[PDB]
Amino acid sequence: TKETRETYEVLLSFIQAALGDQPRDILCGAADEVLAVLKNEKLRDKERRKEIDLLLGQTDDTRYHVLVNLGKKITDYAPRQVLDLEDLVFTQGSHFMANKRCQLPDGSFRRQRKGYEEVHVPALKPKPFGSEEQLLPVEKLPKYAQAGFEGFKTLNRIQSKLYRAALETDENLLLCAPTGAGKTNVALMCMLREIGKHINMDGTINVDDFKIIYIAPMRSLVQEMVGSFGKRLATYGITVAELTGDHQLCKEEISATQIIVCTPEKWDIITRKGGERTYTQLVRLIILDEIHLLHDDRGPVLEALVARAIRNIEMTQEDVRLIGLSATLPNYEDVATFLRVDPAKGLFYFDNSFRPVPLEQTYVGITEKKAIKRFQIMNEIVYEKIMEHAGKNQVLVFVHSRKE
Amino acid sequence: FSSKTEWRVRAISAANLHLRTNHIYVSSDDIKETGYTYILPKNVLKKFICISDLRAQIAGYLYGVSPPDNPQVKEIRCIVMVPQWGTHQTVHLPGQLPQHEYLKEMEPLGWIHTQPNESPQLSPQDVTTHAKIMADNPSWDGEKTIIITCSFTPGSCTLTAYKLTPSGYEWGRQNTDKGNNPKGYLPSHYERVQMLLSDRFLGFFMVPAQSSWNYNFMGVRHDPNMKYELQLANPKEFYHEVHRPSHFLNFALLQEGEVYSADREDLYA
Amino acid sequence: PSRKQTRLTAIDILTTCAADIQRQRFLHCTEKDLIPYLEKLSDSTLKETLLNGVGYLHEGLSPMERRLVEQLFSSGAIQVVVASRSLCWGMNVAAHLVIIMDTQYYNGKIHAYVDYPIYDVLQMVGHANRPLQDDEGRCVIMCQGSKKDFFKKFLYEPLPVESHLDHCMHDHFNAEIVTKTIENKQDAVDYLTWTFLYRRMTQNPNYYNLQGISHRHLSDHLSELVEQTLSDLEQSKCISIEDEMDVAPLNLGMIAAYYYINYTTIELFSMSLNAKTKVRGLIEIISNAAEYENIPIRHHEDNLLRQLAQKVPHKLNNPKFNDPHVKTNLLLQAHLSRMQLSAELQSDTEEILSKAIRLIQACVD
Amino acid sequence: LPIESQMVSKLPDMLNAEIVLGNVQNAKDAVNWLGYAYLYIRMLRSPTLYGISHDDLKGDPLLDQRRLDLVHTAALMLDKNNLVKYDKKTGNFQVTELGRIASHYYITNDTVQTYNQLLKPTLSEIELFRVFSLSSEFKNITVREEEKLELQKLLERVPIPVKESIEEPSAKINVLLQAFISQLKLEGFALMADMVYVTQSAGRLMRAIFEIVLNRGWAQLTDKTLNLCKMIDKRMWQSMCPLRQFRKLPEEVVKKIEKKNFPFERLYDLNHNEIGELIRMPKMGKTIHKYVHLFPKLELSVHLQPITRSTLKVELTITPDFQWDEKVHGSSEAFWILVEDVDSEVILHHEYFLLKAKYAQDEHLITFFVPVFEPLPPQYFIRVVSDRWLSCETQLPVSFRHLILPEKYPPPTELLD
Amino acid sequence: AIHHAGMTRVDRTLVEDLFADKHIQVLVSTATLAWGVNLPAHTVIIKGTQVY
């Protein structure tokens, strides 16, 4: 009843204040359980209070009385055809787990404990260096590009793998390489080629011939990218910036800006208004960074960008380089077709063995019937992880909420 | 009292005042024929109804001229809004009459005010107000200036026009007590007068120079002896943000609340 | 709107035609037939654009070249063509559809865009007429949001026309006084009554800032008018006003009237040229001229002007590079140093030079 | 993991914006466009997943038919909401201003039709907020039991009455927007995240409202909506001192000048000393002054002459009255000039005027014509307002009290037959 | 040690300095830490696998 419901809401608020942000199933369950204990008559004196403290965390001598009061104030315990895009478009996009089955590695195993399954996989084994092979120093690659690589004596294995197609071809690129492989410095070269395409004897990198567009999936990423891209490409004398501009105040500002970085969305609105149509035809290069965002709900935007770019090039007959960067995932040849990358000379694939620091991943899950119980189990799991971080290693926990 | 609830109820109410605007009635009753007859342009009437509120009386001051070669009709060409505040039964507006250049071309015809409940008489508060203006102002002629009462009828607006009789003027000059039934009040004090709405010409507004007109939400900032200038511009609505600073000035907040949810996601523009 | 915009527009049209999946739709003869015409060409891109039957015309084009293009079009050799706005007046070849876009043109002097004069627009529109054959003629005017309603109103209705004499006034009173057509203030008012201004003033008095439609209103207005025109003319020592009634021409005014110039120009001259002035000064004084102020700047050419100054014999004192007087100073020095230029500003140089000598001689006088 | 396209969900919105850019005229160009999508190659190489049986795939190998059907469905969706006028016969699309506004603000086509049906000239702020709250972009936002305790408190601490609505999503979204503008911190985390969503989307939403309602010409509501836009952008109500938009200023000083009521435009009369004397904080006297003269101010003159009995010509002369600093005003400053009719009811004309960096202190001359009507009115008004700047406006009554209209023109001599 | 956007501006950099020099083996931060300025960890472990 309402006389009761109005108190239930207050109880929920009180439980929320203790726990903080949590899944709805778990918080509600805990509240129902705290209330259950209060209502039940098998516990007397400190005992019930102690049990509540163990469950809801430390409680002020003043807060417990209020909780008890709430409990006491509780009365009871051909022509086209129309189709539905709802059942068609996939719900919870990018979390779908579409593949029917997953193949476990030999190293990986399963050990289930009470309330939680724990999975362990060891570190990967680096592919042996090829016979008569070696990493390219910053010497043996073309004269001009070498500038701005200072502090760095040698190229990474993968960087060294594809540098040739990077600087010698306008063929579109796709690389799939694990986190840590240092992917940026590959794309950097793809830029140093274009920066080199316009050069003079008595002046270097004359900058009004090219405007480059770097599309990155996240906002901070844009900041830091303009930050390092500036330093790197500065040898050519090129100035870049983030496109946060409101359309009209900063257009004439970004008029003088080259190699601008932005989120796909920004590029799409700004093209819909036409802020782009003053820029374009001065654009020989667009970078799609983390193009696997195609799988996200945000995916259609990237799809809208690239589609427009291609469909447009067919009218103008003036072409543009397109450089895709993706995490290592199948459907690579499909994204290739999409970017009009010639699979022959333009396609690049590398599997999970190329992550610079090999990754041994263990997965732990809770099969608890009740969310309330599951929340308690999660805390216990963290403690086990902490013990391993007992030695000289760095541990780090990414929680669902900042407050949490 | 505080009427915190009252401020909101009436506020979402008044957002429909413009509906009234297109249903209005006008008192037709016996024409003296020796009297003047006043024409009110419909546009100012609409706007004046639209700025008002259904409890507090608001008032406006009438300015007009008689058309050429037709001295017995007074066209009302202008309404002036001055710093003021109302009650449900009356309106307190300052001693100074409008002074301004656009006004020099015309004569004052009296005033007009909103009247929450319809009464078939000129409220004692009114005859008293009018007489007391007239006492202090020779500029206002007894026979030429009127009080137009605009009452809110259901889903509608309905209006009448009064003149003080000399009996009335004397009573009102004299009268102290502002209660709803003062001593010596009589129906002999006022007289109905002939008024017509018109779509033939447009009236215009005059409005306070450095502020707006509506002081209801600051009563302590209003004084009988307060001075004001004017400008050519339209009145803001009763509940308009400007008339209520105290309410938009309710913020007690520590900035660091923003620390929470420091995930900033934007990726636009 | 632009001299250069004509080239670009043709290329854009060609690209659109290519997209339509059918190319060279605007060429009604084979490529073998156009060869005799293309042999006469300098411009390389024009050769291409003319390949599909498309055409263009601008300040660059010679009269023969123009006559040829017109011939090819009317005879049906070429399907469509683009043209600079300046050529709306002097163009002898008509059409079926005529579309005007970017009517507002760029002015360097105030650094802003300004609308096409309405009569121009009407002329461009009248350029779609083919009475011999067509039963209709068509026009599409692409313009800004602001400027939409104005055209919707004034292209269809007949046009009003008002007098400007009230503003440009002095020169004629001066010249007329010189002929002794105006011997005294009265003759001046009388002269005024022969004009179109006289006609219009009482018709739409608020336009001429005349406050009433009455008799003494108009009379007082014309009076105040000759009063101040003769005063301003006497202040400038172009005339002498005797007894307050009569007038006579003086030395200055006599000169002015004789050589027929912008009167303000030679007044400026009068307060500028002094005993010690020499070619340095004569350059800038002759530059500030009424004729000089008539120079046209395209696309806010300010940086180019600064670059030109950077290498000219005489530098300037904090010059603004959107100002045509500065531009004519620099173009003039450029001519004196026999320096090569882009034909764009070279045409301009030639036009300046056309009227230069007269001004110079006036300074001599 | 396969990389698949979520394109189908957004297909109606994507199609619009392409018609808006003029890149698709008709159905055919639409199928040609969609033939460039990732969803196209995925529908080609895995039809089984995308809703195509293999037999009808064999029946149409190129997917010409299925793609055309999808395009037709998208067109129908766009039309029913009046983004596009497209008849099935020709297969051609026509753009509407509503469509353009929709594309330009990346607002969905359900929201935009909600605005089309809801928005009327006579809307109060009270109602403007509700219409905002009805945006289809917010469709999934709901009100949780636990938070309905705080929402009530917030509901009584808001300046604009929501009370039209009780606790339902509309109210939550409304009170949230107000909370954000009123700068209020929220206890619940759910509400915080929610509020963030609402306010971030609110810029584009309110703006598309302004654009629409301005294109219609309804003066009062375009004021209320641009002002709302500014209030969202700056996170304050107008009732607060404009000096706040300069973040360079101390909070206690601002609050101090708000304490005494001394109308802002009255700060220009005062010198550096006279300023500090108001709040009795003379040490601040110089710095305040800087800001007061940094605040964008235009003064404007007008020269008006009648052209025909129907139309007058207006020459507006804008003279910058403020000191430019590119670390404040930046490269450009934006202003709407709009001439409003007698009652400030209808907008007779409006232009977007933009004063660049170089040209501060240079008076700009704008020339435009306005109509006049049969009951010749006492005056028009010429309003000029900064786009982004809040509480920054200058109004110029243009009085016709002395206007003498030209004699009406006789009919042209008839063409005889 | 825990680092989050919520706390501060400069003390984030002052915490990052503390972690690089091995001040704190275990730290808790929001995803914005992974997307922002780049520092790795010997072993990482997201908790609960859920987001709002």
mmCIF file of C-alpha atoms in Angstrom, chain B:
data_model
loop_
_atom_site.group_PDB
_atom_site.id
_atom_site.type_symbol
_atom_site.label_atom_id
_atom_site.label_comp_id
_atom_site.label_asym_id
_atom_site.label_seq_id
_atom_site.Cartn_x
_atom_site.Cartn_y
_atom_site.Cartn_z
ATOM 1 C CA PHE B 1 0.834 35.075 3.640
ATOM 2 C CA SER B 2 3.904 33.690 1.871
ATOM 3 C CA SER B 3 1.732 32.248 -0.912
ATOM 4 C CA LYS B 4 4.589 30.155 -2.321
ATOM 5 C CA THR B 5 2.063 27.769 -3.876
ATOM 6 C CA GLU B 6 0.069 30.750 -5.170
ATOM 7 C CA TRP B 7 2.995 32.114 -7.174
ATOM 8 C CA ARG B 8 3.219 28.911 -9.239
ATOM 9 C CA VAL B 9 -0.491 28.076 -9.684
ATOM 10 C CA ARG B 10 -1.229 31.552 -11.007
ATOM 11 C CA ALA B 11 1.930 31.447 -13.072
ATOM 12 C CA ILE B 12 1.038 28.454 -15.186
ATOM 13 C CA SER B 13 -2.480 29.824 -15.269
ATOM 14 C CA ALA B 14 -1.509 33.194 -16.777
ATOM 15 C CA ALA B 15 0.295 31.465 -19.666
ATOM 16 C CA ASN B 16 -3.215 31.012 -21.066
ATOM 17 C CA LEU B 17 -4.366 34.624 -20.801
ATOM 18 C CA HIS B 18 -4.018 34.998 -24.548
ATOM 19 C CA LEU B 19 -6.929 32.624 -24.899
ATOM 20 C CA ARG B 20 -9.233 35.179 -23.269
ATOM 21 C CA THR B 21 -7.990 37.676 -25.775
ATOM 22 C CA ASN B 22 -10.405 36.644 -28.524
ATOM 23 C CA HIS B 23 -13.557 36.541 -26.406
ATOM 24 C CA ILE B 24 -14.416 39.955 -24.991
ATOM 25 C CA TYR B 25 -17.638 41.704 -24.123
ATOM 26 C CA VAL B 26 -18.326 45.379 -23.845
ATOM 27 C CA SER B 27 -20.956 47.019 -21.756
ATOM 28 C CA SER B 28 -23.658 48.568 -23.870
ATOM 29 C CA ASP B 29 -25.939 50.675 -21.742
ATOM 30 C CA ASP B 30 -27.791 53.981 -21.846
ATOM 31 C CA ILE B 31 -25.860 56.647 -23.761
ATOM 32 C CA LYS B 32 -25.897 60.138 -22.208
ATOM 33 C CA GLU B 33 -25.301 61.579 -25.729
ATOM 34 C CA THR B 34 -23.900 64.808 -24.322
ATOM 35 C CA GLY B 35 -20.914 62.761 -23.235
ATOM 36 C CA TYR B 36 -17.661 61.846 -24.952
ATOM 37 C CA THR B 37 -17.289 58.403 -26.460
ATOM 38 C CA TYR B 38 -14.018 56.528 -26.235
ATOM 39 C CA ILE B 39 -12.552 54.174 -28.823
ATOM 40 C CA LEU B 40 -9.971 51.611 -27.610
ATOM 41 C CA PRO B 41 -7.739 50.070 -30.275
ATOM 42 C CA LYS B 42 -7.930 46.321 -29.926
ATOM 43 C CA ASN B 43 -4.237 45.588 -30.101
ATOM 44 C CA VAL B 44 -3.271 47.371 -26.906
ATOM 45 C CA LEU B 45 -6.251 45.701 -25.227
ATOM 46 C CA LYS B 46 -5.042 42.255 -26.228
ATOM 47 C CA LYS B 47 -1.482 42.925 -25.024
ATOM 48 C CA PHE B 48 -2.701 44.513 -21.798
ATOM 49 C CA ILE B 49 -4.799 41.441 -21.028
ATOM 50 C CA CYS B 50 -1.859 39.236 -21.880
ATOM 51 C CA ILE B 51 0.602 40.789 -19.465
ATOM 52 C CA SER B 52 -1.846 40.707 -16.552
ATOM 53 C CA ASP B 53 -2.513 38.192 -13.808
ATOM 54 C CA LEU B 54 -5.789 36.796 -12.547
ATOM 55 C CA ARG B 55 -5.403 37.991 -8.980
ATOM 56 C CA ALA B 56 -3.263 41.112 -8.778
ATOM 57 C CA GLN B 57 -4.816 44.117 -10.495
ATOM 58 C CA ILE B 58 -2.555 45.743 -13.024
ATOM 59 C CA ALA B 59 -3.266 49.188 -14.347
ATOM 60 C CA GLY B 60 -2.357 51.342 -17.317
ATOM 61 C CA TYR B 61 -2.758 54.989 -18.161
ATOM 62 C CA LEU B 62 -4.731 56.135 -21.212
ATOM 63 C CA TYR B 63 -3.475 58.715 -23.689
ATOM 64 C CA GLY B 64 -5.261 59.824 -26.858
ATOM 65 C CA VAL B 65 -6.594 62.592 -29.102
ATOM 66 C CA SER B 66 -9.952 63.312 -30.713
ATOM 67 C CA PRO B 67 -10.003 62.798 -34.476
ATOM 68 C CA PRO B 68 -9.935 65.915 -36.643
ATOM 69 C CA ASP B 69 -13.244 67.729 -36.905
ATOM 70 C CA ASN B 70 -14.862 65.297 -34.509
ATOM 71 C CA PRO B 71 -14.441 66.596 -30.991
ATOM 72 C CA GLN B 72 -16.947 64.313 -29.240
ATOM 73 C CA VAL B 73 -15.004 61.049 -29.683
ATOM 74 C CA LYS B 74 -11.701 60.252 -27.993
ATOM 75 C CA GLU B 75 -9.420 57.773 -29.715
ATOM 76 C CA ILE B 76 -7.159 56.110 -27.172
ATOM 77 C CA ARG B 77 -3.839 55.883 -28.963
ATOM 78 C CA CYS B 78 -1.513 54.906 -26.180
ATOM 79 C CA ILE B 79 -1.232 53.005 -22.932
ATOM 80 C CA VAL B 80 1.485 53.805 -20.409
ATOM 81 C CA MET B 81 2.658 51.249 -17.822
ATOM 82 C CA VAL B 82 4.367 52.678 -14.717
ATOM 83 C CA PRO B 83 5.998 51.034 -11.700
ATOM 84 C CA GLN B 84 3.084 49.560 -9.784
ATOM 85 C CA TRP B 85 1.754 46.655 -7.771
ATOM 86 C CA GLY B 86 -1.731 45.303 -7.156
ATOM 87 C CA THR B 87 -4.061 43.719 -4.624
ATOM 88 C CA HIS B 88 -6.982 41.584 -5.743
ATOM 89 C CA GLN B 89 -9.239 44.559 -5.129
ATOM 90 C CA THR B 90 -7.003 47.547 -6.045
ATOM 91 C CA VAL B 91 -3.776 48.894 -7.516
ATOM 92 C CA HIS B 92 -0.968 50.961 -6.057
ATOM 93 C CA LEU B 93 0.827 53.099 -8.626
ATOM 94 C CA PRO B 94 3.052 56.139 -7.914
ATOM 95 C CA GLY B 95 2.232 59.830 -7.575
ATOM 96 C CA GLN B 96 4.142 61.030 -10.654
ATOM 97 C CA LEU B 97 2.075 60.966 -13.853
ATOM 98 C CA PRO B 98 3.747 59.933 -17.111
ATOM 99 C CA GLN B 99 6.018 62.652 -18.552
ATOM 100 C CA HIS B 100 7.534 61.971 -22.053
ATOM 101 C CA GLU B 101 8.003 63.375 -25.582
ATOM 102 C CA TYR B 102 5.771 60.994 -27.550
ATOM 103 C CA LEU B 103 3.124 61.855 -25.058
ATOM 104 C CA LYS B 104 3.197 65.625 -25.628
ATOM 105 C CA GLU B 105 1.003 65.321 -28.757
ATOM 106 C CA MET B 106 -1.936 63.763 -26.918
ATOM 107 C CA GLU B 107 -4.089 64.313 -23.841
ATOM 108 C CA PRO B 108 -4.572 61.966 -20.877
ATOM 109 C CA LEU B 109 -7.875 60.059 -20.985
ATOM 110 C CA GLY B 110 -7.595 58.388 -17.571
ATOM 111 C CA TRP B 111 -6.583 54.773 -16.807
ATOM 112 C CA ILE B 112 -7.509 51.074 -17.340
ATOM 113 C CA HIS B 113 -7.157 48.126 -14.956
ATOM 114 C CA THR B 114 -7.760 44.402 -14.577
ATOM 115 C CA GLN B 115 -10.481 43.256 -12.204
ATOM 116 C CA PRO B 116 -10.317 39.638 -10.966
ATOM 117 C CA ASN B 117 -14.009 39.456 -10.152
ATOM 118 C CA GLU B 118 -16.728 41.096 -12.201
ATOM 119 C CA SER B 119 -18.832 43.711 -10.438
ATOM 120 C CA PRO B 120 -21.481 45.930 -12.007
ATOM 121 C CA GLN B 121 -20.161 49.008 -10.206
ATOM 122 C CA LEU B 122 -17.050 51.164 -9.969
ATOM 123 C CA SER B 123 -15.206 49.925 -6.893
ATOM 124 C CA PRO B 124 -14.921 52.518 -4.101
ATOM 125 C CA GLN B 125 -11.165 51.988 -4.304
ATOM 126 C CA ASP B 126 -11.378 53.188 -7.895
ATOM 127 C CA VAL B 127 -13.556 56.306 -7.515
ATOM 128 C CA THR B 128 -11.366 57.222 -4.586
ATOM 129 C CA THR B 129 -8.165 56.608 -6.611
ATOM 130 C CA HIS B 130 -9.439 58.619 -9.559
ATOM 131 C CA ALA B 131 -10.668 61.561 -7.546
ATOM 132 C CA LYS B 132 -7.336 61.617 -5.714
ATOM 133 C CA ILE B 133 -5.444 61.718 -9.049
ATOM 134 C CA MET B 134 -7.690 64.471 -10.199
ATOM 135 C CA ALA B 135 -7.167 66.488 -7.081
ATOM 136 C CA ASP B 136 -3.441 66.467 -7.566
ATOM 137 C CA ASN B 137 -3.729 66.761 -11.329
ATOM 138 C CA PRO B 138 -5.352 69.675 -13.261
ATOM 139 C CA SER B 139 -3.929 67.955 -16.311
ATOM 140 C CA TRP B 140 -6.735 65.417 -15.832
ATOM 141 C CA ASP B 141 -10.116 66.926 -16.713
ATOM 142 C CA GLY B 142 -13.092 65.684 -14.719
ATOM 143 C CA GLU B 143 -15.320 65.356 -17.740
ATOM 144 C CA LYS B 144 -12.754 64.040 -20.162
ATOM 145 C CA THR B 145 -11.037 61.237 -18.243
ATOM 146 C CA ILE B 146 -12.402 57.790 -17.439
ATOM 147 C CA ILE B 147 -11.736 54.505 -15.670
ATOM 148 C CA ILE B 148 -11.971 51.423 -17.909
ATOM 149 C CA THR B 149 -12.533 48.279 -15.857
ATOM 150 C CA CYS B 150 -11.537 45.076 -17.587
ATOM 151 C CA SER B 151 -12.891 42.026 -15.715
ATOM 152 C CA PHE B 152 -11.984 38.376 -16.205
ATOM 153 C CA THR B 153 -15.101 36.427 -16.963
ATOM 154 C CA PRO B 154 -15.011 32.700 -17.485
ATOM 155 C CA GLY B 155 -12.818 32.016 -20.531
ATOM 156 C CA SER B 156 -13.312 35.597 -21.310
ATOM 157 C CA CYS B 157 -12.629 39.255 -20.690
ATOM 158 C CA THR B 158 -15.388 41.828 -20.320
ATOM 159 C CA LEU B 159 -15.177 45.581 -19.900
ATOM 160 C CA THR B 160 -17.038 48.702 -18.805
ATOM 161 C CA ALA B 161 -16.102 52.424 -18.735
ATOM 162 C CA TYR B 162 -16.808 54.897 -15.929
ATOM 163 C CA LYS B 163 -16.709 58.639 -15.319
ATOM 164 C CA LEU B 164 -16.797 60.257 -11.907
ATOM 165 C CA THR B 165 -19.753 62.536 -11.220
ATOM 166 C CA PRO B 166 -18.961 65.692 -9.242
ATOM 167 C CA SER B 167 -20.649 64.091 -6.190
ATOM 168 C CA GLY B 168 -18.260 61.240 -6.646
ATOM 169 C CA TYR B 169 -15.238 63.395 -7.192
ATOM 170 C CA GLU B 170 -15.851 65.236 -3.926
ATOM 171 C CA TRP B 171 -16.464 62.020 -1.958
ATOM 172 C CA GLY B 172 -13.303 60.522 -3.374
ATOM 173 C CA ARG B 173 -11.105 63.517 -2.729
ATOM 174 C CA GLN B 174 -12.360 63.296 0.859
ATOM 175 C CA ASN B 175 -12.209 59.527 1.365
ATOM 176 C CA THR B 176 -9.625 57.889 3.619
ATOM 177 C CA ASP B 177 -10.928 54.388 4.328
ATOM 178 C CA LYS B 178 -9.972 51.956 1.534
ATOM 179 C CA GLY B 179 -12.099 49.050 2.750
ATOM 180 C CA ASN B 180 -14.686 47.505 0.445
ATOM 181 C CA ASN B 181 -17.445 49.496 2.084
ATOM 182 C CA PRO B 182 -16.400 53.043 3.016
ATOM 183 C CA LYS B 183 -18.794 55.485 4.667
ATOM 184 C CA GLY B 184 -20.844 57.668 2.348
ATOM 185 C CA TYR B 185 -20.183 55.718 -0.826
ATOM 186 C CA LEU B 186 -22.971 55.911 -3.387
ATOM 187 C CA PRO B 187 -23.920 54.680 -6.876
ATOM 188 C CA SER B 188 -24.524 58.404 -7.474
ATOM 189 C CA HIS B 189 -20.764 58.860 -7.550
ATOM 190 C CA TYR B 190 -20.013 57.378 -10.937
ATOM 191 C CA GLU B 191 -21.575 57.138 -14.360
ATOM 192 C CA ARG B 192 -21.142 54.590 -17.160
ATOM 193 C CA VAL B 193 -19.744 55.956 -20.420
ATOM 194 C CA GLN B 194 -19.736 54.855 -24.047
ATOM 195 C CA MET B 195 -16.736 52.912 -25.305
ATOM 196 C CA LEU B 196 -16.039 50.863 -28.467
ATOM 197 C CA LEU B 197 -13.258 48.489 -29.480
ATOM 198 C CA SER B 198 -11.571 49.046 -32.818
ATOM 199 C CA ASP B 199 -9.498 47.281 -35.434
ATOM 200 C CA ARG B 200 -9.224 50.486 -37.502
ATOM 201 C CA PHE B 201 -6.050 51.846 -35.899
ATOM 202 C CA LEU B 202 -3.218 50.568 -33.674
ATOM 203 C CA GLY B 203 -2.430 51.831 -30.221
ATOM 204 C CA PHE B 204 1.083 51.772 -28.773
ATOM 205 C CA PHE B 205 2.757 51.259 -25.387
ATOM 206 C CA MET B 206 4.965 53.394 -23.150
ATOM 207 C CA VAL B 207 7.018 51.591 -20.547
ATOM 208 C CA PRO B 208 9.410 52.410 -17.677
ATOM 209 C CA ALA B 209 12.837 53.677 -18.645
ATOM 210 C CA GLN B 210 15.334 51.814 -16.473
ATOM 211 C CA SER B 211 13.205 48.926 -15.174
ATOM 212 C CA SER B 212 9.988 47.260 -16.031
ATOM 213 C CA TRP B 213 6.542 48.152 -14.766
ATOM 214 C CA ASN B 214 5.630 45.247 -12.512
ATOM 215 C CA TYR B 215 6.689 45.710 -8.943
ATOM 216 C CA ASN B 216 4.383 43.116 -7.418
ATOM 217 C CA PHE B 217 7.303 40.857 -6.698
ATOM 218 C CA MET B 218 9.143 43.678 -4.921
ATOM 219 C CA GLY B 219 6.800 45.678 -2.698
ATOM 220 C CA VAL B 220 9.538 47.304 -0.675
ATOM 221 C CA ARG B 221 11.102 48.715 -3.825
ATOM 222 C CA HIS B 222 7.952 50.651 -4.635
ATOM 223 C CA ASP B 223 7.184 54.118 -3.274
ATOM 224 C CA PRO B 224 4.445 56.715 -3.861
ATOM 225 C CA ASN B 225 7.046 59.367 -4.423
ATOM 226 C CA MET B 226 9.195 57.269 -6.763
ATOM 227 C CA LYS B 227 10.224 58.923 -10.044
ATOM 228 C CA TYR B 228 10.529 57.276 -13.454
ATOM 229 C CA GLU B 229 11.204 57.998 -17.089
ATOM 230 C CA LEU B 230 9.681 56.309 -20.121
ATOM 231 C CA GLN B 231 10.434 54.621 -23.405
ATOM 232 C CA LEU B 232 8.735 53.335 -26.504
ATOM 233 C CA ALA B 233 8.683 49.553 -26.085
ATOM 234 C CA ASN B 234 6.212 46.867 -25.086
ATOM 235 C CA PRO B 235 5.406 45.544 -21.589
ATOM 236 C CA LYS B 236 6.890 42.205 -20.442
ATOM 237 C CA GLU B 237 4.487 39.572 -19.132
ATOM 238 C CA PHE B 238 3.582 39.466 -15.427
ATOM 239 C CA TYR B 239 5.651 36.439 -14.556
ATOM 240 C CA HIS B 240 8.493 37.439 -16.859
ATOM 241 C CA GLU B 241 11.905 36.600 -15.475
ATOM 242 C CA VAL B 242 12.781 40.239 -14.919
ATOM 243 C CA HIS B 243 9.851 40.989 -12.639
ATOM 244 C CA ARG B 244 10.983 38.248 -10.300
ATOM 245 C CA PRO B 245 14.657 38.576 -9.556
ATOM 246 C CA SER B 246 14.505 37.058 -6.051
ATOM 247 C CA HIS B 247 13.489 33.733 -7.506
ATOM 248 C CA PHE B 248 16.202 33.441 -10.129
ATOM 249 C CA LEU B 249 18.577 34.647 -7.449
ATOM 250 C CA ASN B 250 17.802 31.515 -5.495
ATOM 251 C CA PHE B 251 20.969 29.558 -5.825
ATOM 252 C CA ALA B 252 22.785 28.320 -2.771
ATOM 253 C CA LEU B 253 25.330 25.925 -4.203
ATOM 254 C CA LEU B 254 28.897 24.841 -3.786
ATOM 255 C CA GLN B 255 30.722 24.496 -7.134
ATOM 256 C CA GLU B 256 32.362 21.132 -6.263
ATOM 257 C CA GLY B 257 29.092 19.317 -6.854
ATOM 258 C CA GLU B 258 30.467 19.294 -10.396
ATOM 259 C CA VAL B 259 33.320 17.024 -9.147
ATOM 260 C CA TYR B 260 30.793 14.212 -9.147
ATOM 261 C CA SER B 261 30.120 12.812 -12.629
ATOM 262 C CA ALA B 262 33.459 14.137 -13.852
ATOM 263 C CA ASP B 263 33.067 11.975 -16.924
ATOM 264 C CA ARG B 264 32.594 14.839 -19.354
ATOM 265 C CA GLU B 265 31.427 13.125 -22.534
ATOM 266 C CA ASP B 266 30.706 15.622 -25.311
ATOM 267 C CA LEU B 267 32.120 14.938 -28.796
ATOM 268 C CA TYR B 268 29.972 17.624 -30.428
ATOM 269 C CA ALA B 269 30.699 20.912 -32.215
#
